[PDB]
């Protein structure tokens, strides 16, 4: 299986969509990340299933997870990313609002910060418009910066018709 499909299918990574490798291969989309993660080349090769050009292997795997997360945060602000997250949303992959009166409204992932290492991913309910902590501990080690502070708002700007019927 591809590294991306594998990563996204791991327990705890249910909120991630699979980034189109074509988006990753257009180098301009990754601008700046070359100075934001360790082992940039080896991590990117891993993400793209390229032949690896141990102690180091663990560090490279960690680097790949970080780089993929940062790429993901950018991707979900683009047409493909938004569409894929919208499909996951319709399937309830991110869970449902715990408020009794929101009647299991599906939620969307959101970051309290765009800086890695500041907060773990939270969930935004479009109905009550509040942010919640994931009910499952399997999601408590997923960095919110891989989803971002502006993702839900961008999704609704592009797909206003999904905005809860509570204006």
The number of residues that bind Mg ion (CB under 5 A) is 1
> Cα(25)–Cα(139) distance, rounded to whole angstroms?
29
DSSP state for residue 49 in the 8-state scheme:
T
**Is 69 in contact with 143 (CB distance < 8 Å)?**
yes
Is 128 annotated as contributing to ligand binding?
A: yes
Distance CA 64, CA 47 (A): 6
Q: Which is nearer to Zn ion, 81 or 126 (CB)?
A: 126
Q: Of residues 107-166, which lie at the interface with Zn ion (CB under 5 A)?
A: 125, 127-128
Q: Are 5 and 47 in contact (CB under 8 A)?
A: no
Tokens 């971002």 -> residue: 148
- Site for a copy of itself, rule CB under 8 A: 98-101, 104, 112, 122, 130-133, 135
Question: Among 22, 35, 58, 103, which residue sits at the site for Mg ion (rule: CB under 5 A)?
Answer: 22
Which of 6, 10, 3 has its CA nearest to residue 141?
A: 10
Judged by beta carbon, residue 129 or residue 157, the one nearer a copy of itself is 129
Cβ proximity to a copy of itself, 81 vs 144, nearer residue: 144
State the nearest-atom distance from the C-beta of 111 to Zn ion, in Å.
Answer: 18
DSSP helix/strand/coil, 31: coil
Segment interacting with Mg ion (CB under 5 A) among 20-28, 44-52, 115-123, 128-136: 20-28
CA distance 126 to 152: 8
Q: Could you list the residues that contact Zn ion (CB under 5 A)?
A: 97, 99, 102, 125, 127-128
Residues of the binding site for Zn(2+): 97, 102, 125, 128
């Amino acid at each position: 299986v591809s590294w991306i499909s594998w990563f996204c299918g791991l327990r705890g990574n249910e909120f991630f969509c699979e980034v189109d490798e074509d988006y990753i291969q257009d180098k301009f989309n990754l601008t700046g990340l070359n100075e934001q993660v360790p082992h940039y080349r080896q991590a990117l090769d891993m993400i793209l299933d390229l032949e690896p050009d141990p102690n180091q292997s663990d560090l490279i795997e960690q680097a790949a997870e970080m780089l993929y997360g940062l790429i993901h945060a950018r991707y979900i602000l683009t047409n493909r990313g938004i569409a894929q997250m919208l499909e996951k949303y319709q399937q309830g992959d991110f869970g449902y609002c715990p408020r009794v009166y929101c009647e299991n409204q599906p939620m969307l992932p959101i970051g309290l910060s765009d800086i890695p290492g500041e907060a773990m991913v939270k969930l935004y309910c479009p109905k009550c418009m509040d942010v919640y902590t994931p009910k499952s501990s399997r999601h408590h080690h997923t960095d919110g910066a891989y989803f971002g502070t502006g993702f839900p708002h961008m999704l609704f700007m592009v797909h206003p018709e999904y905005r809860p019927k509570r204006p």
